[PDB]
Design a protein around this nucleic acid. Structure first.
Lengths: 41, 49, 23, 152, 254, 265, 192, 154
RNA sequence: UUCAACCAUCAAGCCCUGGGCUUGUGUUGGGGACCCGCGGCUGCUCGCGGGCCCUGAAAAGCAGUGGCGGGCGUGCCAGCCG
């Protein structure tokens, strides 16, 4: 398709101008409460 | 032409477990990975050409 | 002279602004 | 739909037909490409034309690699319009430009054997060459007695 | 914290700072020693040298087993070399004191029993072959045991050499060890009857014979002239088999 | 090759270039060099040789003091520069204007404009034989498309691991180095290429006819015996020419064939 | 995605290797060497990769024993950018065979846990034990080729894998081409 | 460390009776520090200026592109004050500048300056004068698109 | 998802004692006048190699010659020869 072919062109341009590290992991949180992390005492 | 029998490493490990310097545990070949979600960075989202 | 040296030394027509006389 | 032709220049040494095809195939499907090369030694003239199937993809690739600094070369990528893209641009495209040793052609042609009539006309022609050179030397104030070539 | 500083230096590209911070880490792969020093732990665990001699059975079996393994991430090659060197120093002490008493060839290995200061010391050494590391053992905690046991055996060797009045550590010839001297790479020097059973004989060990146990037993029971084949290693009294001074020859060929 | 015809050609072409320059006049006469053109019956070499051969002359070339001599040596350049400052005679000290090692040459003159500037800043380039194989890549086609200023091979090795340049330079004695440098600056250059035509320097316009003739005959002599393959039956024609004058024949052969086996009926 | 600089670098590496192989072929022209496969360029020319297949250096950190002949010297000179080779000593040969020695029987890898395996596999040649094998390998006997064919290539380790900030770094850095002579023994000690 | 051996070598030279210039050469380093770089730009000594994109407060560098444009200095905005700090052996550098490089890097500096001039300045010459921001939220854009679609349908 | 460096910073062979000789192929692309030698072209001219200048590592069709093998007769070879 023309839309997919254009999307391939944009993806190639993005990889050429910015690199291939396009994604980042985010933690899955089963709970809504944020707790203070436990550190060394 | 003597064929050695047994494993001396396993014998020493069994000796340690029997004498009680440590307890018998099994190998964990794969550990459970942290549950994460992959998302695209803001700069790569806002890239326009 | 060199073209590379001319490119490095290329500036504008504005005179340089000096805060004080330098030794 | 409409084909898109991109003219690329300032090509560094090593950035040739196969590299261009493999690189711009990531951008999109390439139908034709031709790197302008020298006739005498086979070396490139640091420019090429790539004809993509899609003009939008060609335009995107040109805007991506316009003024790209590659191996000390600031690459030039422009899109030629369909109005003045030349109809004779892509003969010799999509195939290897072989390197022919014209030096070795001259060597084997000069060392190959011939026929007796051919050396007779060679003796004759070299005699008229000597005669013309002697006529030119006559105004020079110089005289040279050239021995006549014996015929085989 | 030092490893975090090393990671920061490597991420910022300061290779000189990274190397300078890395030399303070005391890595086992570059020192041959444990990463963490257990000298204060040795005195706590063994109040008496008699208790050290009583745990020498486990220590010697452990280190003689890990003298012959390939290098791993837990136990590096330099650590294995230090194991072999400590075992060779202990064997040299047994040779010069004639403390070796009994030996046995079992289907599992070679059992050695010696007597040091009235304490019977029995340990097992594998035959020199390719030892198999299986997944049924905890090799990393075995390496921790190795670190503790070399830390013990170093002080045991130092005390024994000082008690017999010899300088410790012994002079070690890297060129001879490179050529394959094994026990012959050590030269013992002074500081500042079953023991003479093989004293008057001259032995020649063939290549198919177990060189390290034969040499250790003969030198501990009084033999002073032992030669062998050139491929068995440097340090032989003689190499040619046609030497007329040879009295006994050990062969195991059909 | 008769020398009377050679000297007659010498007066002829000298009179021609004088009457051509007469149409500063003395400066226009000066710095006009003389070319000896050899045509062979075969290509003189099977591939492009980029190391010029040296021919020793009784009357040396480049004797003028206005020339610039650039010397390329192995690492370090420090030993050779202190040698230039201390233990060469004053004429060679004034003639040598730049001493640069291979490392600094590759570091500073990778640019084509840098190579062309170095080409224009000097007249004659001498190069040590330990590094002359790496000089085509370092100097590019600027120094080797034209055979006028190709680096002349000189031997600076002390004639008998990785050598440390600061500790030792593998140095051969300096007065005989001076002799080698003057021999190289006096020797003429012959360039071997896959061609039936070669050109060798024999003299300048203001030089006198009998030393021109002596240079021509001796350059012909060692050129035929040493470097031209299959010698005289491969030699076809000899010409002497200026930059703007036509060929002046000296020796024209009777045969056009290298051997009788090529003659096939 | 692959970069244009990577394409240019690969083309220049291939043409430089082609020039080097042409120089070796136009230039043409009995000890024991230990050869260790290291990391080089990604694309390998067909003749060096066939020489690597014959020398069984397919994987990184594989070590083999080679008898120095004219043909073997030419092959090593060809595959110099992908190998590190030197003269092993008696201690290196002994430690490699005793610690990491594996045998090739029926196409499988079996460790040398006994002299018996050598006895049924090389006993027709007089090699009946591990020290006979060591003698043949070290002294380069008449049966060195069959001994090296029996011996599996040695899988050496990566000491940098023991230290976390440089866990991904290769132990042997490429660039020091040519024979390392006796300095291959330090690499054997560190990797064995 | 390198400064320590340099001072020790200069101390030995002045002990045996030579000037520090006799044993030490002219240095070529990356100029950094905001006041230093601003002075170099004003005196037209800097040949290339790199300005970090995330300087907080932004008033420290908000005038630097205009100053470089007035004084005819090639400038470029780059990502990472920490990235410049890795160059200048610091945690953070707001701006760095090249005044002079060595003779081995004349060509590389000139080519980098030309690449900057043709690939950054000419591309941002017209985008630098436009107003930024003004982006609506996700729900706001969805509501606005639905409203315009309803208006077009009705 | 490294645009680094890496040829010989000397070797081998001759003379046989003099320090000399041989080999080790290794070049960005164009433009402008202009003297030439040689090989085809009836000839003009076209090629080969030389000579004199200019240039940011500069660039806007004009693609040209006989084949071995390999791939599917061939505007295919990250394979070569003539």
């Amino acid at each position: 398709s023309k839309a997919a072919k254009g999307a391939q062109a944009k993806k190639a341009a993005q990889a050429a101008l910015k690199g291939v590290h396009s994604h980042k992991k985010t933690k899955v949180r089963k709970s809504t409460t944020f707790h203070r992390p436990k550190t060394l005492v | 032409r003597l064929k050695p029998e047994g494993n001396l490493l396993k014998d020493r490990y069994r000796s340690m477990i029997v004498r009680g310097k440590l307890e018998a545990r099994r190998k964990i070949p794969f550990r459970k990975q942290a549950k994460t979600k992959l998302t695209e960075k803001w700069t790569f989202k806002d890239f326009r050409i | 002279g060199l073209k590379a040296d001319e490119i490095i030394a290329q500036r504008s027509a504005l005179p340089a602004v000096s805060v004080r006389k330098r030794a | 739909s409409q084909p898109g032709v991109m003219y690329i220049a300032r090509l560094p040494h090593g950035f040739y037909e196969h590299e261009l095809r493999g690189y711009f195939s990531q951008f999109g499907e390439i139908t034709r490409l031709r790197v302008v090369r020298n006739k005498k030694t086979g070396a490139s003239r640091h420019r090429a034309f790539i004809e993509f199937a899609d003009a939008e993809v060609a335009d995107i690739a040109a805007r991506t690699m316009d003024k790209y600094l590659l191996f000390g070369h600031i690459l030039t990528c422009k899109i030629v319009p369909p109005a003045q893209v030349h109809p004779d641009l892509f003969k010799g495209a999509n195939r290897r430009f072989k390197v022919v040793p014209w030096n070795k052609m001259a060597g084997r042609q000069l060392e190959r054997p011939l026929s007796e009539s051919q050396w007779q006309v060679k003796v004759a022609k070299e005699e008229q060459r000597r005669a013309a050179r002697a006529e030119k030397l006559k105004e020079m104030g110089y005289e040279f007695e050239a021995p006549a070539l014996k015929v085989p | 914290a030092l490893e975090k500083k090393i990671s920061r230096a490597l991420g910022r590209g300061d290779v000189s700072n990274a190397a300078r911070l890395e030399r303070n880490a005391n890595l086992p792969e570059k020192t041959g020693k444990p990463r963490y020093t257990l000298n204060h732990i040795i005195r706590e665990r063994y109040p008496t040298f008699q208790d050290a001699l009583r745990d020498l059975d486990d220590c010697l079996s452990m280190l003689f087993l890990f003298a012959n393994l390939p290098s791993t991430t837990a136990v590096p090659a330099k650590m294995i070399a230090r194991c072999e060197r400590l075992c060779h120093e202990f064997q040299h002490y047994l040779i010069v004191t004639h403390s070796l008493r009994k030996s046995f060839l079992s289907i599992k290995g070679i059992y050695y029993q010696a007597n040091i200061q009235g304490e019977d010391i029995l340990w097992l050494v594998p035959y020199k072959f390719n030892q198999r590391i299986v997944g049924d053992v905890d090799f990393r905690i075995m390496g921790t045991f190795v670190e503790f046991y070399m830390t013990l055996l170093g002080f045991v060797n130092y005390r024994l050499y000082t008690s017999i009045g010899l300088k410790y550590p012994p002079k070690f010839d890297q060129v001879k060890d490179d050529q394959g001297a094994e026990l012959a790479a050590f030269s013992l020097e002074g500081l500042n009857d079953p023991s003479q059973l093989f004293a008057n004989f001259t032995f020649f060990l063939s290549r198919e014979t177990p060189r390290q146990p034969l040499e250790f037993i003969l030198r501990a029971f009084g033999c002073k002239r032992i030669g062998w084949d050139a491929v068995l290693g440097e340090g032989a009294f003689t190499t040619d088999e046609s030497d007329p001074r040879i009295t006994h020859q050990i062969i195991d060929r059909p | 090759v008769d020398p009377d015809q050679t000297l007659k050609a010498c007066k002829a072409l000298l009179a021609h270039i004088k009457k051509a320059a007469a149409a500063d006049e003395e400066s226009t006469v000066a710095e006009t060099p003389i070319w000896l053109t050899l045509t062979t019956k075969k290509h003189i070499h099977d591939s492009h040789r980029l190391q010029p051969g040296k021919i020793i002359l009784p009357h040396p070339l480049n004797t003028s003091e206005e020339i610039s001599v650039c010397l390329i040596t192995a690492d370090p350049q420090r030993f050779y520069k202190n040698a230039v400052a201390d233990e060469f005679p004053e004429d060679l000290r004034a003639k040598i204007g730049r001493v640069i090692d291979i490392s600094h040459l590759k570091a500073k003159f990778k640019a084509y404009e840098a190579q062309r500037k170095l080409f224009s800043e000097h007249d004659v380039f001498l190069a040590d034989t330990r590094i002359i194989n790496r000089l085509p890549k370092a100097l590019g086609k600027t120094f080797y498309k034209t055979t006028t200023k190709r680096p002349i091979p000189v031997v600076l090795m002390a004639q008998r691991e990785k050598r440390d340049p600061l500790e030792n330079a593998n140095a051969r004695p300096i007065p005989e180095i001076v002799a080698e440098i003057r021999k190289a600056i006096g020797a003429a250059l012959v360039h071997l290429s896959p061609s039936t035509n070669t050109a060798i320097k024999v003299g300048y316009a203001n030089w006198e006819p009998e030393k021109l003739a002596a240079n021509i005959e001796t350059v012909i002599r060692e050129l035929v015996e040493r470097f031209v393959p299959q010698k005289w039956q491969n030699v076809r024609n000899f010409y002497v020419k200026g930059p703007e004058t036509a060929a002046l024949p000296i020796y024209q052969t009777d045969e056009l064939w290298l051997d009788e086996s090529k003659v096939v009926p | 995605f692959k970069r244009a600089e990577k394409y240019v670098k690969e083309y220049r590496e291939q043409e430089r290797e082609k020039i080097r192989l042409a120089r070796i072929a136009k230039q043409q022209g009995a000890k024991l060497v230990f050869v260790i496969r290291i990391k080089g360029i990604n694309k390998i020319p067909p003749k060096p990769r066939k020489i690597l297949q014959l020398l069984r250096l397919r994987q990184i950190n594989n070590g083999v024993f080679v008898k120095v002949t004219k043909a073997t010297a030419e092959m090593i000179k060809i595959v110099e950018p992908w190998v590190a080779y030197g003269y092993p000593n008696l201690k290196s040969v002994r430690e490699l065979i005793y610690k990491r020695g594996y045998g090739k029987v029926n196409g499988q890898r079996i460790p040398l846990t006994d002299n018996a395996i050598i006895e049924e596999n090389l006993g027709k040649y007089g090699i009946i034990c591990i020290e006979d094998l060591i003698h043949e390998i070290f002294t380069v006997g008449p049966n060195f080729k069959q001994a090296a064919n029996f011996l599996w290539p040695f899988k050496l380790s990566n000491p940098n894998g023991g230290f976390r900030p440089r866990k991904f770094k290769h132990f042997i850095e490429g660039g020091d081409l040519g024979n390392r002579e006796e300095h291959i023994n330090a690499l054997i000690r560190a990797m064995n | 460390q390198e400064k320590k051996e340099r001072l020790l070598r200069e101390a030995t030279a002045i002990k045996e009776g030579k000037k520090k210039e006799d044993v030490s050469k002219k240095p070529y380093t990356v100029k950094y520090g905001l006041n230093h770089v601003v002075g170099l730009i004003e005196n037209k000594k800097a040949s290339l200026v790199l300005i970090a994109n995330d300087v907080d407060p932004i008033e420290l560098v908000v005038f630097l592109p205009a100053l470089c444009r007035k004084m005819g200095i090639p400038y470029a905005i780059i990502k990472g004050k920490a990235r410049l700090g890795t160059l200048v052996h610091k945690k953070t550098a707001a701006v760095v500048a090249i005044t002079e490089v060595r003779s081995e890097d004349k060509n590389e500096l000139a080519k980098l300056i030309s690449a900057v001039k043709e690939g950054y300045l000419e591309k941002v010459e017209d985008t630098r004068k436009r107003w930024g921001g003004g982006i609506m939220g996700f729900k706001a854009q969805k509501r606005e698109e639905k409203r315009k679609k309803s208006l077009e349908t009705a």
